[PDB]
Ligand binder design. Structure first.
Ligand SMILES: Nc1ncnc2c1ncn2[C@@H]1O[C@H](COP(=O)(O)OP(=O)(O)NP(=O)(O)O)[C@@H](O)[C@H]1O
Ligand SMILES: Nc1ncnc2c1ncn2[C@@H]1O[C@H](COP(=O)(O)OP(=O)(O)NP(=O)(O)O)[C@@H](O)[C@H]1O
Ligand SMILES: Nc1ncnc2c1ncn2[C@@H]1O[C@H](COP(=O)(O)OP(=O)(O)NP(=O)(O)O)[C@@H](O)[C@H]1O
Ligand SMILES: Nc1ncnc2c1ncn2[C@@H]1O[C@H](COP(=O)(O)OP(=O)(O)NP(=O)(O)O)[C@@H](O)[C@H]1O
Ligand SMILES: [Mg+2]
Ligand SMILES: [Mg+2]
Ligand SMILES: [Mg+2]
Ligand SMILES: [Mg+2]
Lengths: 285, 285, 286, 286
């Protein structure tokens, strides 16, 4: 398609540069804007013709970082010193293979399997890892914040959705399968998928119907999930994980060979394969 | 009727050019505009008087492509084509089917405004429906609309799709109007017929009423439908039929002789006739 | 368990004989009592005490014919000339095998497959055969009488449930599966065996209505509970109404013959009803 | 079917006698009993054990005169030109004998689907007078005008005749009206277990009302269930009111004559009723 012949004035052009400035600094909310740059926020809000541009610039900045720029481009900025690499080795999982899946999963390239699942006993790093990734994406939603009756609202404009320590009820089991499967919502189709990560101590394939466990949806939920078993406690020295840990870890994994990935990626298994001593990278051996 | 004499200004002329640009590139929604041309969208939304033009232009662009211009103009080796293989495998004359679609999509079949695809599952019923539905300017689906109010938002569409449809007694009287091409009562007082395609694994002539099927409406529905039997299963690798195949197929059907179709057009039959080995046009014999 | 040692008076014994009389003559409703025995109905309703026995005797009479007696006994009592035998031959189904399956199905001995499904084009004897079976059992009720949003009320206390020209919606699809599979309703568990179901339809009922669409998520589950018969061959318009004498004669004849093939199939029930084997047909039907 | 051999006491026998007395003297309502026999009515209500017998007697009396005894017997009584009914039918160019032989079949539900009589024409032609005359003769009769507007067909069972004076059919009730006009029992009666109908009108009732608009979609289906008589010639102003004595005399006379003229018309039940043949009219009416 040929771009339109229209030419913008200096006021319109300066607005365009402001939209580009917002994306380049990851400023996607009004509260974030005030902290990052209060002088420009004060100047813009001086008039009704300027306070309008505050709303419009944020709606366009969100769209640019969500539907035009792939999310992985935000994640790409001694490997053994990185806390995430140590954590995945403590859980007996290959740090390279997990990292390569995250790049594919956050880009919605996995097809139906749009859902991750960190499963294990309490205090094993499940919430920390999930929140660390969520901090490194432009905008992320959360089921816990939403209404208890409509947990799957406000999914548009989110590059990621975090469902921490959640359980699937029968009243929302049908809406869950749509979101977990990456299928766009019926409302989205009429008015026109987001990666989902779940942490849990119990098996979420058991749907809560009334006061009774049900296993009707066991197969449907497994076709959409990839499960990681976090069954080993982490030393308290781990503390809180930073965004730079994710960026360093994912940048290294992207530059390595992908050959091991598509071999497993041909047959998407519900459970993530464990460590094999043959396929370990020499840097981690 | 002579057009109004008064000429416009530079600002209004540029808006008119933008409207003609939207129709050319088949941009009828804001999301389609952002994906195609984010630059012009950003500049327009720099002011209140600019974001007004975005809403005003799209409403005129949709109206131009639906009411002022015939839909067939947006629709426009022969054996190699996937669709003609699909039609021949079902033992239906490809020239007759293509010549019917052009007259049907233009709302010129009188009372028989509705096509119907019937047959066993996985025989390409929905695949062909989407191919035609994706080529028209704007298409709507009964699935998207509200469960108890399925025929809202039917104006402004070039085609309405009813996939896996079943006619309930609560909407059977509303369905008969839209199936026959009769304009809706609200459309009358705020002032016009849209083609409908139905794909179903079952005989939709059977109307559901409670926990029981009734045939009192069978004769009336047969007056408005045209039926195609997709009985033979197709190749497992048929693939997604695209806009290019529809444009190729209908263009060839338009070029050939129309005398054969007008014999059938004199009296419309509920069942669509099959191929005659000698009446088949020499490009396909 | 030993019955209680107590004995009744003259009045209590006469009431017991009245309850037995209702079962023999199949009087399970007041309207049936009025048609048959108006004299005894007039004598009983002459007082408030007597009118109580009318309501109470029907409760025990219906219960005896539904729980204390197998339903096959009320079905039992030239075979080629039987109209049902003619109907099953036109549709290419073995009369001996159909009858032998009905007897076990009407007695809830088929396990999961508690449902019979008749399918075919219109005017093929689907309702006729179903109605004849339905009117031969002591008490029958149809889904077509119940409320639209509560199709399965009054199911308990019946010998058969008929669902004529029926279709399954996603709102009741969960309630339907329990009854079709013979699983007792939740309310029955906390207030205390299912009821055999026969369904006739011109379309495929495995498809489940949801909104204005069709779905097959319940297609596999429903097939585990139903046995399907294909009523495709057009019948002669002068076949007429199938009667109880046709049903009783047909089932009694099937009960008399050997079951040898039936145990072979009954090892693993299939969804579709198997067709006729020309060599396995009984010589009395040849 | 052998009746139960239980024999009641003296008190129960007397109640049975009182049931036979109510049916004999056409006493079917509480008020009618007070007019006909106040001495017995006072005696029964002297105690609670007695005032219960009153309700049970009326329930059985209405049933015996509606569901067990044919209605035609009560229309019959236990110069023909002297009857004012024949005068009315002659003016409308209708053979008086053929009309009477039809009523004996229409009131007994024997006319198949064509269950409802329709009287049509300009005002003051005796449509209501004739219809109310037959209505007053049957044991128990109900009217649609008495029932509430939203549910016109409550309390239909237990009635020997339903009258619909100057009626109009709305689309909200057209589906329910089709069953009662066609003689089909309603859904309620089927689960808890045919009434002749007469309609008079100044206009075409087949024009079903729908909103502020008149539609003809149901006209063909309604015509399948009605018989029409066109009352056009205005009667003499001194017509008076038709009585049950005239209905009993006219209908009894029509029973005695031959039926071959009517039995031939029953071969094809047309919508309109045939007119007078100048030479086929019975000699007594000449
Ligand atoms: N805010 C924090 N500050 C310091 N250390 C933290 C913090 N959050 C988590 N940790 C450390 O991270 C490790 C596990 O934490 P966490 O991710 O919360 O496990 P968890 O599985 O989510 N607990 P649970 O929610 O019950 O499943 C421990 O070593 C904690 O000390
Ligand atoms: N997205 C797709 N990509 C490739 N092939 C497809 C796709 N969708 C359908 N097909 C093929 O199209 C053929 C028929 O599919 P489909 O159009 O879905 O039939 P269908 O009638 O819609 N099934 P049903 O809805 O149950 O009646 C098969 O050979 C499929 O493999
Ligand atoms: N009451 C009846 N009187 C006369 N013939 C009857 C009657 N009931 C059924 N038949 C005949 O029985 C045959 C099949 O009728 P029926 O059993 O009603 O098929 P059907 O499946 O119920 N029709 P449909 O509901 O459209 O599928 C036809 O030849 C009918 O004429
Ligand atoms: N109770 C009565 N006493 C005397 N004359 C009566 C009585 N009822 C009706 N008539 C007469 O009977 C004739 C016919 O009137 P009627 O039977 O009421 O027709 P109608 O159908 O009621 N008029 P309409 O309802 O407008 O079509 C008239 O001459 C009336 O005066
Ligand atoms: Mg946690
Ligand atoms: Mg499909
Ligand atoms: Mg039927
Ligand atoms: Mg009047």
């Amino acid at each position: 398609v040929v771009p339109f012949n229209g030419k913008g004035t200096k006021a319109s052009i300066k607005f365009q540069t402001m939209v580009n400035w917002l994306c380049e600094n990851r400023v996607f909310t009004e509260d974030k804007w005030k902290l990052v740059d209060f002088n420009q926020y004060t100047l813009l809000s001086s008039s009704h013709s300027g306070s309008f541009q505050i709303q419009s610039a944020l709606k366009l900045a969100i769209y640019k970082a969500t539907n035009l720029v792939p999310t992985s481009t935000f994640l790409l900025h001694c490997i053994k010193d990185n806390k995430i690499v140590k954590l995945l080795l403590c859980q007996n999982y290959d740090p390279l293979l997990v990292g390569q899946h995250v790049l594919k999963w956050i880009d919605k390239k996995c097809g139906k399997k749009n859902t991750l699942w960190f499963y294990g006993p309490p205090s094993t790093g499940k919430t920390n890892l999930a929140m660390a990734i969520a901090k490194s994406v432009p905008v992320y939603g959360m089921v816990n914040w939403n209404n208890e009756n409509f947990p799957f609202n406000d999914v548009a404009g989110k590059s990621l959705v975090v469902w921490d320590e959640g359980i699937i009820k029968s009243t929302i089991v049908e809406a869950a399968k749509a979101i977990l499967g990456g299928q766009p919502t019926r409302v989205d189709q009429k008015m026109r998928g987001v990666p989902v990560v779940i942490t849990s101590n119990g098996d979420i394939t058991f749907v809560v119907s009334g006061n009774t466990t049900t296993t009707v949806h066991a197969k449907a939920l497994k076709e959409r999930m990839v499960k990681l078993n976090f069954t080993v406690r982490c030393s308290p020295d781990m503390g809180l994980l930073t965004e730079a840990d994710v960026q360093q870890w994912l940048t290294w994994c992207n530059a390595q060979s992908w050959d091991h990935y598509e071999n497993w990626a041909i047959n998407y298994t519900f459970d993530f394969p464990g460590i094999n001593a043959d396929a370990l990278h020499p840097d981690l051996q």
